[PDB]
Design a protein around this ligand. Structure first.
Ligand SMILES: Nc1ncnc2c1ncn2[C@@H]1O[C@H](COP(=O)(O)OP(=O)(O)OP(O)(O)=S)[C@@H](O)[C@H]1O
Lengths: 255, 164, 603
């Protein structure tokens, strides 16, 4: 039940919780935020409901069942990336939680080898975010935060697989968070922070509509010598086309 | 005093038969017993419609002279006290019982469906002693009329309801 | 294994410095969880250790208890070098292991297995309280050579105190009922509970123990001097209170997604019965069970049906419940002849031989999370009747008795085969008057299977043809192929689903699906309930209470499980209302014919 939580009106200055968030992710690595300014427009996430008319082709909402409308939001200004969904309150929450996520990165990613390249997602604004909506047996595979950092609202949003991570007991770790925003670091920042991170399986929840503001580093992002030739973008794009059914267009079928 | 309560049998069978009948009915056990009651909490009509929402309730969901201070006033009345009842309200209770018996001796010509007009003679002294306690609430060595008359009205409502 | 100092070193290479999948030491987490929780008990994830060093895992066969005793002391010094405070906090720490592939059932244990590690299933039949066990007679009390002043014949008396006491709870574990083949008494094995595991288990509940299998003696000699009572005792080391193939559930869904399942199941619910679809329907309904729902607000209401079968001689009711005993998962068949109320519910006794308090799970307790099948009600004493009424209302068995206090939970449903007073159904006379069972226990049940035998020139001819064909069909590797497949051809002569499919089906259902409702019809079904209430006040006396309503949804959810919907459907709720209303109809007097129209507004 114990998850580190902080007051943000005391740290709205961005000068109070710079190194302790790193010192606490060193062991816990799954953070919980509370009471930001977005406590009302956050509630209004029932705008983008019934589009269901645009084919996927690796952009926009995958209509995969009436059950799932997964807005794989291909970032807006990138080369061969241009997508905008209605997402009215969803995009307002995007801007808010995006400023908050830059806040969180610039207070945590600052602790590591280089604190410019990942947040280099402010140069080109390379956020291909994850607007999943399970709107009206087994469901999506245990979901690691595909990117490297993501803050996102949540109701249950947590499980745990048989594996060696935080809470290594390998039993499903499911908790309830009434009015709490879950932050989770993703895959490659562990490698960037030299192995201090974890993962958390996801499933369908009372908040079956996961808005996920993946910081989603830029396209040509040169990963360390192990990933100088394997950038994070194409790796996690193959990942994006791995877990769901990939049949709309040919290249993901081939992948 | 005593406290006797449990989940009544047949659900709300207490509504059909006497206010008693939480346990066996035999009139012999009831003999030494003095007063029977029913409690009203804020769920009565949940038996017609709200029961639906009720199971949905399962699915989708001091400001007073302190406790020790009441115990303190009580120990200080166990110490010394003489707040006895008042003769005028006493005769008022005697009236609002005997004149009831006289109106009903007159209405015997109507042949009331009340089974057998009982001697309300231990319940009457019960009311007398409760007005005595409501006077103890006010220290008056001859009972003030406020508490005594309130208790009189409420216990005649109770006794009348029982008779009904 | 004397030089095992180096071996303890090599196994303590895995002690802290093992991690996997981005660090996060398996025990680096455990050590701090102990430093913060103080539970004096280490977990050992056997999956990962099995990957670590095969020799260490295999060392659980030759001297497994010696192995573990060497291991846990160094685990203690490990968490102490990590937390120099921890050694003083507790007195001593013993480890626990995660899981084994060895699933030796209680019916299978051999001398080769003893003193080794074993993981067994079963049910806690009954348990005891804490023992201050004894454990120059250190713990002999049968071996006294010349330590007596009058040692020739004048007896010297030793005390039974000042001696070391181990937390010691002897729990009887028996084979799971139903799985026990008919005739054989289920085995008993005394498992031992200790410091951390004491009182962690109750009776009536499934358990899985992982302890070693010692051949240890008990000082309760009771037979001869130099001869303690030797019991093959399981020493517990981890307790778990708690699969099938993918395409199995896939084709399973492929079937269950049809439209005929809700009636194919019925027509396959009973292997050799003619007619009685209505009673087979109620059987299936109370077999599948419904989603229970605890209510801290007013009172926990169980979602478990309770069918009373008011039978009549000739009608195959006992055969139905015998089928149920076979098919269901937790059947406890018990007849009203050997009732002995102490037996049905749980009870607590003192054993005369050992002078020890035990409390033994009753039939209701032994059946928890299942079906308790009783018959010949009217042939049992009224006190059994009272105890069972109590149990049904609270769906559990509290107990506060001499030296003990707890509350066993007895969710398990009840099927009951009855027999009307004297002979058969007299007439259309009311069901209550027709049976010597009390109105409270009658209302405790929800469904009342009213069966009746009636002479007919034709229906009995067809039924007879059926029964005769039944007695006809009753009676190497390729012979076994030709035999299994011919048994399956007979399984298809009763055309719907074969049996094994259906028992896997009921297991799947009672495991995974937990359907619910929508707001839409619940107030219109309360409307239909009010209409029933007016048709019942037109009937004079009637038990139409909240139970009679809640039964409807409790049946509809079972129907949803049948359909695997996770949410009620229209047709299923109509089936439920039909079953309940006409089950009521049968109970009533001549009015029944009028009733056929009176409360007909539903249909
Ligand atoms: N449809 C049927 N098909 C085949 N046999 C049937 C059928 N209906 C009844 N039977 C017969 O019923 C027998 C079992 O009936 P039971 O349920 O045991 O009656 P019963 O309840 O034992 O009678 P009691 O309890 O003494 S009043 C079977 O052995 C069959 O011979």
């Amino acid at each position: 039940l114990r998850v580190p939580v902080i007051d943000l009106n005391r740290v709205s200055d961005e000068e109070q919780l710079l190194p302790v968030v790193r010192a606490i992710l060193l062991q816990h690595d799954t953070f919980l935020l509370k009471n930001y300014a977005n406590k009302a427009v956050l509630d209004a996430l029932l705008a983008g409901l019934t589009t269901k008319d645009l084919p996927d082709t690796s952009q926009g909402f995958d209509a995969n069942f009436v059950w799932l409308e997964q807005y794989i939001f291909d970032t807006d200004p990138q080369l061969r990336f241009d997508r905008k969904c209605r997402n009215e309150s969803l995009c307002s929450i995007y801007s808010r939680l995006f400023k908050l996520g830059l806040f969180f990165a610039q207070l945590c990613v600052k602790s590591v080898v280089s604190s410019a390249e990942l947040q280099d997602c402010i140069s080109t604004s390379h956020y291909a975010t994850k607007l999943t909506r399970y709107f009206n047996e087994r469901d999506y595979v245990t979901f690691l935060p595909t990117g490297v950092l993501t803050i996102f609202p949540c109701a249950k949003a947590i499980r745990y697989k048989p594996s060696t991570m935080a809470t290594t007991d390998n039993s499903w770790v499911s908790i309830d968070e009434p009015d709490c925003l879950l932050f989770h670091t993703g895959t490659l920042l562990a490698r960037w922070s030299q192995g201090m991170h974890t993962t958390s399986p996801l499933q369908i929840d009372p908040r079956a509509n996961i808005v996920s503001l993946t910081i989603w580093p830029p396209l040509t992002t040169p990963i360390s010598s192990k990933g100088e030739g394997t950038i994070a973008n194409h790796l996690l794009e193959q990942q994006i086309k791995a877990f769901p059914k990939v049949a709309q267009q040919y290249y993901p079928r081939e992948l | 005093s005593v406290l006797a309560a449990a989940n009544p049998i047949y659900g709300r069978y207490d509504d059909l038969k006497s206010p008693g009948d939480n346990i066996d009915f035999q009139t012999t056990i009831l003999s030494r017993f003095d007063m029977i009651f029913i409690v009203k909490d804020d769920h009565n009509e949940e038996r017609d419609i709200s029961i639906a929402n009720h199971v949905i309730n399962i699915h989708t969901g001091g400001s007073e002279i302190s406790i020790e201070k009441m115990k303190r006033y009580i120990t200080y009345c166990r110490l010394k006290c003489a707040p006895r009842l008042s003769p005028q309200a006493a005769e008022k209770l005697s009236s609002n019982f005997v004149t009831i018996r006289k109106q009903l001796l007159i209405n015997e010509l109507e042949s009331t469906e009340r089974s057998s007009i009982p001697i309300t003679i231990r319940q009457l002294e019960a009311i007398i002693r409760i007005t005595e306690s409501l006077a103890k609430l006010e220290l008056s060595p001859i009972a003030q009329e406020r508490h005594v008359d309130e208790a009189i009205r409420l216990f005649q409502a109770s006794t009348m309801d029982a008779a009904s | 294994p004397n030089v095992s100092r180096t071996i303890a070193r090599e196994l303590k290479s895995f002690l802290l410095e093992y991690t996997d999948e981005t660090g996060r030491s398996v025990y680096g987490a455990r050590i701090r969880t102990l430093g913060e929780m103080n539970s004096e008990s280490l977990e050992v994830n056997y999956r990962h250790l099995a990957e670590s060093k095969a020799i260490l895992a295999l060392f659980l066969a030759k001297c497994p208890e010696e192995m573990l005793k060497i291991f846990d002391l160094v685990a203690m010094e490990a968490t102490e070098l990590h937390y120099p405070d921890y050694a003083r906090i507790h007195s001593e720490i013993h480890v626990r292991i995660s899981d084994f592939p060895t699933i030796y059932s209680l019916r299978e244990l051999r001398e080769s297995n003893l003193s080794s590690l074993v993981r067994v299933t079963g049910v806690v039949t009954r348990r005891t309280g804490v023992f201050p066990q004894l454990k120059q007679d250190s713990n002999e009390e049968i071996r006294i050579s010349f330590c007596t002043n009058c040692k020739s014949k004048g007896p010297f008396r030793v005390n039974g105190e000042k001696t070391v006491y181990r937390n010691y709870q002897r729990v009887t574990l028996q084979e799971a009922p139903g799985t026990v083949p008919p005739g054989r008494l289920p085995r008993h094995r005394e498992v031992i509970l200790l410091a951390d595991l004491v009182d962690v288990s109750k009776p009536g509940e499934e358990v899985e123990v992982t302890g070693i299998y010692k051949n240890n003696y008990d000082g309760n000699l009771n037979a001869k001097n130099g001869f303690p009572v030797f019991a093959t005792i399981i020493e517990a080391n981890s307790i778990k209170r708690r699969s099938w193939t993918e395409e199995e559930e896939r084709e399973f869904r492929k079937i269950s997604r049809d439209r005929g399942i809700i009636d194919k199941i019925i027509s396959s619910m009973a292997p050799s019965i003619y007619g009685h679809r209505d009673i087979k329907t109620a059987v299936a309904c109370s077999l599948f069970g419904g989603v229970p729902k605890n209510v801290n607000g007013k009172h926990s209401i169980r979602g478990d049906i309770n069918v009373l079968l008011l039978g009549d001689p000739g009608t195959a009711k006992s055969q139905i419940l015998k089928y149920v005993e076979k098919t269901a998962h937790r059947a406890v068949f018990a007849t009203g002849q050997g009732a002995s109320a102490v037996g049905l519910t749980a009870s607590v006794r003192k054993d005369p031989i050992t002078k020890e308090w035990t409390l033994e799970g009753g039939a209701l307790v032994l059946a928890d999370k299942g079906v308790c099948l009783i018959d010949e009600f009217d042939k049992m004493n009224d006190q059994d009747r009272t105890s069972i009424h109590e149990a049904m209302e609270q769906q559990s068995i509290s107990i506060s008795k001499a030296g003990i206090v707890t509350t066993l939970q007895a969710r398990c449903s009840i099927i009951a085969a009855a027999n009307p007073n004297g002979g058969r159904y007299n007439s259309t006379l009311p069901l209550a008057q027709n049976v010597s069972l009390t109105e409270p226990i009658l209302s405790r049940f929800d469904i009342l299977c009213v069966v009746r035998d009636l002479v007919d020139e034709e229906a009995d001819e067809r039924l007879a043809t059926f029964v005769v064909d039944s007695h006809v069909r009753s009676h190497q590797l390729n012979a076994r192929q030709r035999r299994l497949q011919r048994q399956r051809k007979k399984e298809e002569e009763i055309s719907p689903i074969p049996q094994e499919l259906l028992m896997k089906y009921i297991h799947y259902a009672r495991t995974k699906i937990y359907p619910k409702l929508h707001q839409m019809d619940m107030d219109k079904v309360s409307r239909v309930y009010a209409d029933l209430r007016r048709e019942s006040i037109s009937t004079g006396s009637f038990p139409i209470t909240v139970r009679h309503l809640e039964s409807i949804l409790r049946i509809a959810e079972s129907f949803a499980k049948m359909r695997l919907s996770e949410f009620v459907s229209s047709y299923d709720l109509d089936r439920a209302i039909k079953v309940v209303v006409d089950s009521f109809v049968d109970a009533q007097k001549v009015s029944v014919r009028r009733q056929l129209r009176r409360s007909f507004a539903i249909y």
